[PDB]
């Protein structure tokens, strides 16, 4: 009982293929009210909606440097009916400059009864609908984060199975309304666990989740996989170079995710700006075989200097901007291997 | 990791058996806007707030002869909001006759891709501020839909895991907040399938549901099931005897529901109002061992005369109501095995 | 497609039924060759086939006074083929005292790769021609045994799946050739965790049993269950009274186990003679709703006196019966909830 | 708790490479003495030890110009045990020739209860005794096959979960004694179904099987996968061209088999000598990044001409192992897209 026909499968693979075409990769600038707050927050600058517009629209008409560099970037419900000062809506813009519209659809993560501070998260009520009209106003394709933490008795067994069920509902519905659906199952870096545990956790929550795509019938050709890098704990003692988590990363991806799968897109989840460019171009750099594009998508390892650099001054656009397209520029050449810091 | 504490688990079991104590069973007054308006239709009424009003008023005020037959109402949204005549709100009448108050919370069936016509059902977004906002409105147990149909290649593997599994988080979540839920997997008797078929298939799904129950960490002392009797499909050519969908129906169940589960509520689903009466007599009259109160949860098989009595007239309201406690004492005396037609 | 037939389906009720009949239990006298080793040890009694058979005789020939409390024993395969003095071969002088012959089919544990001390045990290969045999030499039930023990991160999730799916193939190979069998996934008393601890996991492994087995096709009421008792490890810290293990059972066998399971036989697993009897009896006395048969399926705690009083001397017969009747006969009165130490 | 060590991982992983190196692949001589039966049979030649230790000679030994074609080749116990005339063990004469010793472990297919003639496999018992034997004795791999096949329900969920895990138990099993696992989840071509329903369940049973891998916490670079090729049912109506099931046959690989897979070693199941050969040949030409080495393992498609072309007559040894070079020549070339009929 084909879920989609050849006509639907071509669509979904074309957009997919297009977002991760070589040297290009995602800006992830779908912060929600609240978390774009606490950003707003780290520069003296009030939460309004035209000073939420003002930095989606500094971001999202940086000079055309950043064209090359940029397959798609993703959309808050908000911003994606929020127009520049020109007048045009920010999807025409995101589309003018050679990307592709993405539209963040989940709501949010909900605790998970009887477990260890677990969680899963919502969003699918209505997505159906939903997907329909983003389509027709634009995006091409979704993002739907799910959070897995690593501690003592974490992931534990229910989360890992909930979260990569969600996952699949998520992108089932997605592929029925012509959206190409990015599946973010994150592992948060938090914790003192060390690289091997990171590279377990990973590998065992990545095969649960495309074991539950296919339950799902989903499409691979037409998704993405926006995972966590294989890294130790943010306090974890141990010390490791970038080629050991570049190979630890396309190691552990290797033997859990499909070759149909189109493409990868790394988050940064808590690296700098610096140090998600140099581990991305480690990973383009290990040394095995990687069957799928191994690019990013980006929120702070993008933002990062430019909401700095703006502090919420007007008169601070064009040195924001600069910064943006600095780190798009670093990133595109970290998708191909030659970024050289 | 303890999902609920002691002082939890009490007040979810105290309120699952007062809802089927003895001789006592479930009026499934929640047809949402869209159902009651298919009824209102079967007798020229237009669908109106106060014509729905005034008829749910004319149920939930019947004479006192009911009160001992009707341990639990369930209410859609709206319903539970509105008031009777007097000025009570409907919550509170139902509640000083001695009934606990039910909510459906369930938002309707969607539709499961790449599958032949199945469905899963939504309603988990904001699920939890819902409970809490419903037990501070009188509400103190809860009901969720999810529809499996018999054919060729249904219920499909895929199907049964993701009904079983949402039925799951909706039970987590309604524990959290103090409500307790009635997990209903019905197996629509739609299709030419026999006796053993429908019993194959309901221990099947029966079985999937309480594990994930399981892996969801629900209290089942807590919890209540509304499941499909065990019959023929509606198309079936052979024929049964009501002690053998009986035997069928115990039968299925005692290999499926754990004994903890604090009580069985049937559906009528399409059933007349007499043969879900006598059915439900016969299940009590089965030469096995129940472990668990088996009563009803009826909607149309407790309203069918009823709202064909009233036409819609408001001269009509004594006949009316006289069916509707015709048939709660009938399936009263059913739940306990003394039903005499 | 029907596993089983009518007539087998009633063969292996009829089996099971007898088995745990009011006031019977198990003998399980199936000590391999390595395991009766160490018992003969205790006593300085060399390991030999004689010493063997006459400790297995002095067992199964007690005075008529432990018919009424024996249902059935559990034999090896040496013993299923070793004689009494008068020539009977074993199954019959046990079928002659009105018990049914049991036959142990499992070929021990073996380590789970990857695992934290983890296993899973054999027997499978074969199994079908064995049982066939088995049956015609008198068995008509038998056991197979999976340990899992609790600790930090056991059992895990592998443990439980793969214990739950080999205990389903070994049943639906013996309910084919009309042996009924008993699913024993003993949880070892090891470790110091206390009564909830226990609770806990035999709730969630004994819920992967019997999804196991409905997955496998198997016949509820063919079977039987030879569990831990809920108790608290060892090294517990913690005292508890027989009163609340007794309720900690139950209640952990009221939330997994189908009332079509026609009976449960605990393992004492370390317990005294006297200690896993009177368990017994306070589980009979407890305080829920127990519809299935709640007897004892003991090895140690119907031999230990016995053994001792044995010695290896055959003067000691006499004597060392009486032990073994003194116990059977107080286990018989547990399984009735009437013994008084 | 790692289940190999670096050290076990590198000397899995290196056997597994040289099996399957460049224009290498494997010859499946490992019928059992039932199955080398029916192949005698129809030579009219004895089913008799010498007679078979002849043939597998004959194979085993023809000249040299098979070396760089044969990266291993699979005994039956018995062969591997056997001695050529010049008095060199089975295993000397395979490693002498540059290729690795493979040894079957399986003991058959049994019947699933309950489902429609659908079958799982046994041998476990004792595997890793016989594996660290086979490993002292020469043999460095392993092959156990599983058996599915395509009909109105099948294959079922049962029948898919249970022989993906048996498969995974096997692989721990051989792993742990330092034998590279070949896993054969084979689907039979009888039936009448299409190209797509093939692709459809190859690619959920595929699914299945490396999530049990997983599960199963089995090195995935230390193991080689012997999966059907993607074809019509025999007896389907429709015709395809050999481009067609060549792209069905990668694209259902590409989205089920992690690229950390050294290998897959295609079985002929059915094929002709020559089939097998145009279609290995068509999917190492096809049209999509193929990131494992495609190659065979074949039986009759190595060995039908040989074993015609003997008849049993040691007169022919020349002439049928000149049969056998031809098809291993051409499967070679196959192996690397330049076959060339």
Same mark, same amino acid.
């Given at each position: 009982?084909?879920?989609?026909?050849?006509?639907?499968?071509?669509?979904?693979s074309d957009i997919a293929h297009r977002i991760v075409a070589?040297?290009?990769?995602?800006?992830?600038?779908?912060?929600?009210?609240?978390?774009?707050?606490?950003?707003?927050?780290?520069?003296?600058?009030?939460?309004?909606?035209?000073?939420?517009?003002?930095?989606?629209?500094?971001?999202?008409?940086?000079?055309?440097?950043?064209?090359?560099?940029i397959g798609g970037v993703i959309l808050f419900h908000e911003?994606?009916?929020?127009?520049?000062?020109?007048?045009?809506?920010?999807?025409?813009?995101?589309?003018?400059?050679?990307?592709?519209?993405?539209?963040?659809?989940?709501?949010?993560?909900?605790?998970?009864?009887?477990?260890?501070?677990?969680?899963?998260?919502?969003?699918?009520?209505?997505?159906?609908?939903?997907?329909?009209?983003?389509?027709?106003?634009?995006?091409?394709?979704?993002?739907?984060?799910?959070?897995? !933490?690593?501690?003592?008795?974490?992931?534990?067994?229910?989360?890992?199975?909930?979260?990569?069920?969600?996952?699949?509902?998520?992108?089932?519905?997605?592929?029925?309304?012509?959206?190409?659906?990015?599946?973010?199952?994150?592992?948060?870096?938090?914790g003192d666990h060390d690289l091997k545990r990171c590279q377990?956790?990973?590998?065992?929550?990545?095969?649960?989740?495309?074991?539950?795509?296919?339950?799902?019938?989903?499409?691979?050709?037409?998704?993405?996989?926006?995972?966590?890098?294989?890294?130790?704990?943010?306090?974890?003692?141990? !010390?490791?170079?970038?080629?050991?988590?570049?190979?630890?990363?396309?190691?552990?991806?290797?033997?859990?995710?499909?070759?149909?799968?189109?493409?990868?897109?790394?988050?940064?989840?808590?690296?700098?700006?610096?140090?998600?460019?140099?581990?991305?171009?480690?990973?383009? !750099?290990?040394?095995?075989?990687?069957?799928?594009?191994?690019?990013?998508?980006?929120?702070?390892?993008?933002?990062?200097?430019?909401?700095?650099?703006?502090?919420?001054?007007?008169?601070?656009?064009?040195?924001?901007?600069?910064?943006?397209?600095?780190?798009?520029?670093?990133?595109?050449?970290?998708?191909?291997? !030659?970024?050289?810091?």
């Amino acid at each position: 009982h084909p879920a989609l026909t050849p006509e639907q499968k071509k669509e979904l693979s074309d957009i997919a293929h297009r977002i991760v075409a070589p040297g290009k990769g995602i800006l992830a600038a779908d912060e929600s009210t609240g978390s774009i707050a606490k950003r707003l927050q780290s520069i003296g600058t009030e939460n309004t909606e035209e000073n939420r517009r003002f930095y989606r629209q500094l971001l999202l008409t940086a000079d055309d440097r950043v064209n090359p560099a940029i397959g798609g970037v993703i959309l808050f419900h908000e911003t994606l009916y929020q127009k520049a000062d020109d007048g045009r809506p920010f999807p025409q813009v995101i589309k003018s400059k050679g990307g592709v519209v993405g539209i963040k659809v989940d709501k949010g993560v909900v605790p998970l009864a009887g477990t260890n501070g677990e969680t899963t998260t919502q969003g699918l009520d209505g997505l159906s609908e939903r997907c329909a009209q983003y389509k027709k106003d634009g995006a091409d394709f979704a993002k739907w984060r799910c959070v897995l !933490k690593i501690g003592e008795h974490t992931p534990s067994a229910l989360a890992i199975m909930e979260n990569a069920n969600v996952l699949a509902r998520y992108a089932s519905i997605c592929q029925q309304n012509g959206i190409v659906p990015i599946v973010e199952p994150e592992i948060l870096p938090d914790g003192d666990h060390d690289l091997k545990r990171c590279q377990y956790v990973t590998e065992k929550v990545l095969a649960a989740v495309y074991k539950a795509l296919s339950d799902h019938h989903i499409y691979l050709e037409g998704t993405l996989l926006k995972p966590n890098m294989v890294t130790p704990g943010h306090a974890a003692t141990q !010390k490791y170079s970038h080629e050991e988590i570049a190979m630890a990363t396309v190691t552990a991806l290797r033997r859990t995710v499909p070759p149909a799968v189109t493409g990868v897109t790394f988050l940064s989840g808590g690296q700098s700006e610096e140090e998600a460019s140099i581990n991305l171009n480690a990973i383009n !750099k290990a040394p095995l075989l990687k069957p799928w594009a191994l690019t990013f998508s980006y929120g702070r390892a993008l933002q990062a200097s430019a909401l700095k650099a703006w502090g919420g001054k007007k008169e601070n656009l064009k040195a924001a901007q600069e910064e943006y397209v600095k780190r798009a520029l670093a990133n595109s050449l970290a998708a191909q291997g !030659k970024y050289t810091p």
